[PDB]
mmCIF file of C-alpha atoms and ligand atoms in Angstrom:
data_model
loop_
_atom_site.group_PDB
_atom_site.id
_atom_site.type_symbol
_atom_site.label_atom_id
_atom_site.label_comp_id
_atom_site.label_asym_id
_atom_site.label_seq_id
_atom_site.Cartn_x
_atom_site.Cartn_y
_atom_site.Cartn_z
ATOM 1 C CA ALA I 48 20.005 40.786 49.752
ATOM 2 C CA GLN I 49 17.299 37.839 49.676
ATOM 3 C CA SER I 50 13.491 38.303 50.231
ATOM 4 C CA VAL I 51 11.272 35.317 51.235
ATOM 5 C CA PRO I 52 8.393 35.405 49.028
ATOM 6 C CA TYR I 53 4.950 35.833 50.733
ATOM 7 C CA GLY I 54 3.544 32.321 49.318
ATOM 8 C CA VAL I 55 6.336 30.478 51.018
ATOM 9 C CA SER I 56 5.356 32.215 54.269
ATOM 10 C CA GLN I 57 1.787 31.564 53.707
ATOM 11 C CA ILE I 58 1.789 27.934 53.733
ATOM 12 C CA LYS I 59 4.029 28.059 56.811
ATOM 13 C CA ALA I 60 7.133 26.807 55.343
ATOM 14 C CA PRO I 61 9.400 29.000 57.358
ATOM 15 C CA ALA I 62 8.376 27.153 60.668
ATOM 16 C CA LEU I 63 9.751 23.817 59.399
ATOM 17 C CA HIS I 64 13.108 25.756 58.475
ATOM 18 C CA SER I 65 13.566 27.002 61.985
ATOM 19 C CA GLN I 66 13.131 23.341 63.394
ATOM 20 C CA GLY I 67 15.874 22.665 61.095
ATOM 21 C CA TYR I 68 13.661 20.830 57.810
ATOM 22 C CA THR I 69 14.723 22.008 54.569
ATOM 23 C CA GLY I 70 14.338 19.304 52.532
ATOM 24 C CA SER I 71 17.434 17.694 52.537
ATOM 25 C CA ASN I 72 18.054 14.523 50.884
ATOM 26 C CA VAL I 73 14.929 14.774 48.984
ATOM 27 C CA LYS I 74 14.763 14.336 45.263
ATOM 28 C CA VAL I 75 12.153 16.589 43.274
ATOM 29 C CA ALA I 76 11.639 16.385 39.879
ATOM 30 C CA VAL I 77 10.407 19.633 38.085
ATOM 31 C CA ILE I 78 8.940 18.267 34.647
ATOM 32 C CA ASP I 79 8.707 21.343 32.632
ATOM 33 C CA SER I 80 10.703 23.435 30.190
ATOM 34 C CA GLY I 81 13.962 22.806 31.646
ATOM 35 C CA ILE I 82 15.941 24.866 34.703
ATOM 36 C CA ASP I 83 18.419 27.471 33.752
ATOM 37 C CA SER I 84 21.576 26.148 34.903
ATOM 38 C CA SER I 85 23.526 29.616 35.145
ATOM 39 C CA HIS I 86 21.177 31.149 37.803
ATOM 40 C CA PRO I 87 22.985 31.392 40.989
ATOM 41 C CA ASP I 88 20.016 31.231 43.151
ATOM 42 C CA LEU I 89 19.480 27.153 41.935
ATOM 43 C CA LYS I 90 21.346 24.358 42.375
ATOM 44 C CA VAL I 91 20.297 21.542 40.219
ATOM 45 C CA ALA I 92 21.502 17.879 41.048
ATOM 46 C CA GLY I 93 20.814 16.244 37.595
ATOM 47 C CA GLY I 94 18.240 16.139 34.721
ATOM 48 C CA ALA I 95 17.364 14.679 31.302
ATOM 49 C CA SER I 96 15.642 16.043 28.253
ATOM 50 C CA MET I 97 12.977 14.669 26.259
ATOM 51 C CA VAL I 98 12.417 17.048 23.645
ATOM 52 C CA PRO I 99 14.206 15.845 20.682
ATOM 53 C CA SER I 100 14.807 19.186 19.021
ATOM 54 C CA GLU I 101 16.508 20.633 22.443
ATOM 55 C CA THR I 102 18.531 18.039 24.104
ATOM 56 C CA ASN I 103 20.097 20.127 26.803
ATOM 57 C CA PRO I 104 17.629 20.050 29.970
ATOM 58 C CA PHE I 105 19.766 22.745 31.901
ATOM 59 C CA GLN I 106 18.553 25.298 29.152
ATOM 60 C CA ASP I 107 15.067 26.568 29.687
ATOM 61 C CA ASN I 108 13.968 28.611 26.583
ATOM 62 C CA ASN I 109 10.669 29.065 27.840
ATOM 63 C CA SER I 110 11.409 30.367 31.395
ATOM 64 C CA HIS I 111 8.114 28.557 32.727
ATOM 65 C CA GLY I 112 10.261 25.826 34.293
ATOM 66 C CA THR I 113 12.903 28.054 36.026
ATOM 67 C CA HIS I 114 10.072 29.936 37.754
ATOM 68 C CA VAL I 115 8.315 26.951 39.045
ATOM 69 C CA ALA I 116 12.073 25.406 40.214
ATOM 70 C CA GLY I 117 12.546 28.909 42.130
ATOM 71 C CA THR I 118 9.358 28.111 43.918
ATOM 72 C CA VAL I 119 10.334 24.554 45.174
ATOM 73 C CA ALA I 120 13.936 25.385 46.288
ATOM 74 C CA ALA I 121 15.462 28.851 45.418
ATOM 75 C CA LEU I 122 18.641 28.776 47.478
ATOM 76 C CA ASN I 123 19.052 29.883 51.007
ATOM 77 C CA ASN I 124 21.927 32.593 50.763
ATOM 78 C CA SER I 125 22.442 36.106 50.556
ATOM 79 C CA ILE I 126 20.623 36.827 47.065
ATOM 80 C CA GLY I 127 17.385 36.360 45.209
ATOM 81 C CA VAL I 128 14.366 34.518 46.940
ATOM 82 C CA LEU I 129 13.890 31.330 48.816
ATOM 83 C CA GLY I 130 12.280 28.244 48.219
ATOM 84 C CA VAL I 131 10.021 26.046 50.202
ATOM 85 C CA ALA I 132 12.437 23.232 50.243
ATOM 86 C CA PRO I 133 15.799 25.157 49.808
ATOM 87 C CA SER I 134 17.975 22.115 50.495
ATOM 88 C CA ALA I 135 15.752 19.590 47.967
ATOM 89 C CA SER I 136 17.858 17.735 45.341
ATOM 90 C CA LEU I 137 16.245 19.240 42.079
ATOM 91 C CA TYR I 138 16.163 17.732 38.568
ATOM 92 C CA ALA I 139 15.507 19.069 35.622
ATOM 93 C CA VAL I 140 13.261 16.998 33.483
ATOM 94 C CA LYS I 141 12.616 18.726 30.383
ATOM 95 C CA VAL I 142 9.051 17.715 28.335
ATOM 96 C CA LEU I 143 8.256 21.044 26.973
ATOM 97 C CA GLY I 144 9.644 23.262 24.197
ATOM 98 C CA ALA I 145 10.680 26.811 24.003
ATOM 99 C CA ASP I 146 6.910 27.480 22.814
ATOM 100 C CA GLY I 147 5.683 26.316 26.161
ATOM 101 C CA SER I 148 4.219 23.094 24.429
ATOM 102 C CA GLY I 149 5.235 19.526 24.504
ATOM 103 C CA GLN I 150 3.921 16.095 23.452
ATOM 104 C CA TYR I 151 2.230 13.328 25.414
ATOM 105 C CA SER I 152 4.989 11.027 24.877
ATOM 106 C CA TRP I 153 7.807 13.624 25.868
ATOM 107 C CA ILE I 154 5.879 13.990 28.869
ATOM 108 C CA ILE I 155 5.264 10.379 29.584
ATOM 109 C CA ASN I 156 9.307 9.669 28.694
ATOM 110 C CA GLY I 157 9.495 12.344 31.523
ATOM 111 C CA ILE I 158 7.587 10.458 34.241
ATOM 112 C CA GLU I 159 9.191 7.017 33.431
ATOM 113 C CA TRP I 160 12.686 9.028 33.650
ATOM 114 C CA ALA I 161 11.739 10.218 36.992
ATOM 115 C CA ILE I 162 10.251 6.865 38.189
ATOM 116 C CA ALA I 163 13.694 4.925 36.946
ATOM 117 C CA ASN I 164 15.997 7.540 38.695
ATOM 118 C CA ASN I 165 13.939 7.167 42.470
ATOM 119 C CA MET I 166 12.667 10.921 42.416
ATOM 120 C CA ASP I 167 10.617 11.211 45.528
ATOM 121 C CA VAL I 168 8.584 13.861 44.222
ATOM 122 C CA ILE I 169 7.159 15.194 40.527
ATOM 123 C CA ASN I 170 5.822 18.498 39.883
ATOM 124 C CA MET I 171 3.879 19.071 36.395
ATOM 125 C CA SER I 172 2.953 22.522 36.442
ATOM 126 C CA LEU I 173 1.479 21.412 32.728
ATOM 127 C CA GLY I 174 -1.886 20.238 31.939
ATOM 128 C CA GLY I 175 -4.356 19.612 28.948
ATOM 129 C CA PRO I 176 -8.060 19.229 28.641
ATOM 130 C CA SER I 177 -7.623 15.788 27.055
ATOM 131 C CA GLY I 178 -6.166 12.858 29.074
ATOM 132 C CA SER I 179 -4.656 9.753 27.404
ATOM 133 C CA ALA I 180 -4.547 5.927 28.357
ATOM 134 C CA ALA I 181 -0.710 6.067 28.430
ATOM 135 C CA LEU I 182 -0.593 9.000 30.144
ATOM 136 C CA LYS I 183 -2.577 8.075 33.089
ATOM 137 C CA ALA I 184 -0.886 4.532 33.165
ATOM 138 C CA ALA I 185 2.696 6.451 33.517
ATOM 139 C CA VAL I 186 1.206 8.658 36.470
ATOM 140 C CA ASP I 187 -0.537 5.377 38.163
ATOM 141 C CA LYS I 188 2.859 3.863 37.832
ATOM 142 C CA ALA I 189 4.626 6.684 39.485
ATOM 143 C CA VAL I 190 2.105 6.686 42.472
ATOM 144 C CA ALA I 191 2.302 3.088 42.212
ATOM 145 C CA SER I 192 6.102 3.352 42.530
ATOM 146 C CA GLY I 193 5.724 5.479 45.951
ATOM 147 C CA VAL I 194 6.169 8.765 44.159
ATOM 148 C CA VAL I 195 4.213 12.013 45.182
ATOM 149 C CA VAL I 196 2.816 13.365 42.135
ATOM 150 C CA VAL I 197 1.507 17.118 42.083
ATOM 151 C CA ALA I 198 0.255 19.034 39.062
ATOM 152 C CA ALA I 199 -1.475 22.311 38.547
ATOM 153 C CA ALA I 200 -5.214 22.086 38.381
ATOM 154 C CA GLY I 201 -5.314 24.275 35.366
ATOM 155 C CA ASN I 202 -6.138 28.152 34.590
ATOM 156 C CA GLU I 203 -9.584 27.377 32.972
ATOM 157 C CA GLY I 204 -11.713 29.165 35.858
ATOM 158 C CA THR I 205 -15.355 28.264 36.009
ATOM 159 C CA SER I 206 -17.986 26.660 33.705
ATOM 160 C CA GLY I 207 -21.237 26.194 35.557
ATOM 161 C CA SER I 208 -21.287 22.900 37.291
ATOM 162 C CA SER I 209 -18.587 21.518 34.947
ATOM 163 C CA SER I 210 -15.157 20.208 36.465
ATOM 164 C CA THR I 211 -12.524 22.529 34.867
ATOM 165 C CA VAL I 212 -9.479 20.612 36.084
ATOM 166 C CA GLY I 213 -7.116 19.593 33.294
ATOM 167 C CA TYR I 214 -5.055 16.387 32.796
ATOM 168 C CA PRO I 215 -2.940 14.934 34.419
ATOM 169 C CA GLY I 216 -4.332 16.774 37.405
ATOM 170 C CA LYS I 217 -7.775 15.248 36.840
ATOM 171 C CA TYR I 218 -6.451 11.704 37.678
ATOM 172 C CA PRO I 219 -7.332 10.252 41.399
ATOM 173 C CA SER I 220 -3.790 9.462 41.811
ATOM 174 C CA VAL I 221 -2.468 13.234 41.351
ATOM 175 C CA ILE I 222 -2.801 15.917 43.617
ATOM 176 C CA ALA I 223 -4.412 18.734 41.922
ATOM 177 C CA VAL I 224 -3.490 22.218 42.993
ATOM 178 C CA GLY I 225 -5.535 25.390 42.507
ATOM 179 C CA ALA I 226 -4.554 28.891 43.399
ATOM 180 C CA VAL I 227 -5.363 31.259 46.092
ATOM 181 C CA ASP I 228 -4.271 35.152 46.285
ATOM 182 C CA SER I 229 -2.804 36.316 49.834
ATOM 183 C CA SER I 230 -6.248 36.567 51.147
ATOM 184 C CA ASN I 231 -7.159 33.192 50.894
ATOM 185 C CA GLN I 232 -9.619 34.140 48.166
ATOM 186 C CA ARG I 233 -9.516 31.650 44.998
ATOM 187 C CA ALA I 234 -7.895 33.315 42.007
ATOM 188 C CA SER I 235 -10.614 33.929 39.248
ATOM 189 C CA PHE I 236 -8.491 31.746 36.720
ATOM 190 C CA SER I 237 -8.224 28.854 39.101
ATOM 191 C CA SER I 238 -9.703 25.577 37.858
ATOM 192 C CA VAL I 239 -12.552 24.056 39.611
ATOM 193 C CA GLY I 240 -14.387 20.544 39.966
ATOM 194 C CA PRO I 241 -14.441 17.191 42.209
ATOM 195 C CA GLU I 242 -10.944 16.308 41.071
ATOM 196 C CA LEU I 243 -9.202 19.688 42.880
ATOM 197 C CA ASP I 244 -7.557 18.779 45.806
ATOM 198 C CA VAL I 245 -5.902 21.306 47.339
ATOM 199 C CA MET I 246 -5.170 25.225 46.984
ATOM 200 C CA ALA I 247 -1.575 27.049 47.206
ATOM 201 C CA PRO I 248 -0.503 30.559 46.422
ATOM 202 C CA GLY I 249 -0.954 31.048 42.798
ATOM 203 C CA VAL I 250 -0.909 34.995 42.492
ATOM 204 C CA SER I 251 2.003 37.490 42.062
ATOM 205 C CA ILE I 252 4.390 34.456 42.808
ATOM 206 C CA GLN I 253 7.840 35.919 42.794
ATOM 207 C CA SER I 254 10.822 33.570 41.564
ATOM 208 C CA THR I 255 13.744 33.008 39.581
ATOM 209 C CA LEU I 256 13.921 33.801 35.815
ATOM 210 C CA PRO I 257 16.535 32.762 33.172
ATOM 211 C CA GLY I 258 19.461 34.941 32.963
ATOM 212 C CA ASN I 259 20.130 35.762 36.428
ATOM 213 C CA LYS I 260 16.685 37.479 37.111
ATOM 214 C CA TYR I 261 13.379 37.294 39.062
ATOM 215 C CA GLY I 262 9.823 38.026 38.328
ATOM 216 C CA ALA I 263 6.250 37.495 39.463
ATOM 217 C CA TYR I 264 3.690 35.242 37.551
ATOM 218 C CA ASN I 265 -0.034 34.083 38.616
ATOM 219 C CA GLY I 266 -1.272 30.949 37.725
ATOM 220 C CA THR I 267 -1.918 27.165 39.047
ATOM 221 C CA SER I 268 1.768 26.278 37.592
ATOM 222 C CA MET I 269 2.950 28.580 40.438
ATOM 223 C CA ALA I 270 0.871 27.117 43.046
ATOM 224 C CA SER I 271 1.541 23.529 42.456
ATOM 225 C CA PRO I 272 5.439 23.767 43.255
ATOM 226 C CA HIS I 273 4.315 24.962 46.751
ATOM 227 C CA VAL I 274 2.920 21.782 47.359
ATOM 228 C CA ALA I 275 5.703 19.626 45.654
ATOM 229 C CA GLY I 276 8.323 21.658 47.879
ATOM 230 C CA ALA I 277 5.659 20.868 50.966
ATOM 231 C CA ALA I 278 5.874 17.357 50.131
ATOM 232 C CA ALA I 279 9.549 17.564 50.102
ATOM 233 C CA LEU I 280 9.746 19.341 53.477
ATOM 234 C CA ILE I 281 7.780 16.532 55.072
ATOM 235 C CA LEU I 282 9.914 13.803 53.674
ATOM 236 C CA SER I 283 12.695 15.482 55.397
ATOM 237 C CA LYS I 284 11.182 15.228 58.679
ATOM 238 C CA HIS I 285 9.752 11.304 57.910
ATOM 239 C CA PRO I 286 11.810 9.558 55.607
ATOM 240 C CA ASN I 287 9.949 6.466 56.086
ATOM 241 C CA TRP I 288 6.345 7.886 55.448
ATOM 242 C CA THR I 289 5.056 6.759 51.976
ATOM 243 C CA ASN I 290 3.334 9.087 49.280
ATOM 244 C CA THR I 291 0.086 7.568 50.791
ATOM 245 C CA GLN I 292 1.117 9.060 54.173
ATOM 246 C CA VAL I 293 2.476 12.347 52.846
ATOM 247 C CA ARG I 294 -0.645 13.074 50.381
ATOM 248 C CA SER I 295 -3.166 12.103 53.190
ATOM 249 C CA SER I 296 -1.293 14.308 55.855
ATOM 250 C CA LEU I 297 -1.530 17.237 53.356
ATOM 251 C CA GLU I 298 -5.124 16.658 52.810
ATOM 252 C CA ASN I 299 -6.139 16.702 56.390
ATOM 253 C CA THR I 300 -3.947 19.498 57.723
ATOM 254 C CA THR I 301 -5.196 22.068 55.489
ATOM 255 C CA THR I 302 -7.157 25.438 56.259
ATOM 256 C CA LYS I 303 -10.707 24.911 55.150
ATOM 257 C CA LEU I 304 -11.752 27.654 52.873
ATOM 258 C CA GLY I 305 -15.179 27.277 50.982
ATOM 259 C CA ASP I 306 -17.032 24.813 48.954
ATOM 260 C CA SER I 307 -14.372 22.141 47.991
ATOM 261 C CA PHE I 308 -15.760 22.152 44.613
ATOM 262 C CA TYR I 309 -14.040 25.700 44.357
ATOM 263 C CA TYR I 310 -11.134 24.953 47.507
ATOM 264 C CA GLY I 311 -10.803 21.375 47.403
ATOM 265 C CA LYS I 312 -10.039 20.715 51.241
ATOM 266 C CA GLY I 313 -8.357 24.105 51.324
ATOM 267 C CA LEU I 314 -4.967 25.785 51.930
ATOM 268 C CA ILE I 315 -1.944 23.651 52.706
ATOM 269 C CA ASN I 316 -0.086 24.013 56.102
ATOM 270 C CA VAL I 317 2.927 22.086 55.638
ATOM 271 C CA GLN I 318 4.240 23.032 59.471
ATOM 272 C CA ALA I 319 0.848 20.906 60.544
ATOM 273 C CA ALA I 320 1.277 18.398 57.765
ATOM 274 C CA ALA I 321 4.676 17.600 58.883
ATOM 275 C CA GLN I 322 4.171 16.207 62.390
HETATM 276 CA CA1 CA O 95 18.274 33.057 47.534
HETATM 277 CA CA1 CA O 96 -6.876 14.756 41.648
#
């Protein structure tokens, strides 16, 4: 029947579920490669596509977006997996093509969309090594608007003492998420630097795949959603908190693990974070 992936347990999401907080009424935008609307373990509330050659956002041609969405909110039923915030309202915002890539403008368009539609949380399990002025402006706009923005830190490992976090995670207004294994040890591909903020499970993350399938992937793209999902549970318990409050609470309630250059503030603990 249904399994609870370990990563979900590892951030203490189940504890909130038993208090009765499952992400209800919270709008999460997954800014990725779309969400397969034919997967029974997902409930999509809305969406829009910014890729010109692939106008249906409910059609994930890459499978990256569907896996990410499953971590956030795979439904609580008799099958497949379970997500961090299983009652969250999930929006498919397509900005990456079949090949996994996307144009900055598509990405910006997708942020603008999320803003305009009053998304509560945005997940960006994507990144590049270069930022742009307009990317930064849109991300700043989201946070200025009241949205919690989460982004993968990247899968660039270490490079001596240089920062390896990619854009948009490198920006201050964004929560950059690195990955740990089940042992709380950083995964070797996990990006590092001053901008890394928090850690979440990123190794063998079992989630939803297109075509009514399930599978495991590793990477900071798999870690990010854990945090976006955590932000969702907090907002279900404290609808009146601002993103300011949510971000603060997640960063001040972590489990510390090692030099912040490598672990940022540590592993999130949404049970603690949620108050
Ligand atoms: Ca399920
Ligand atoms: Ca950051």
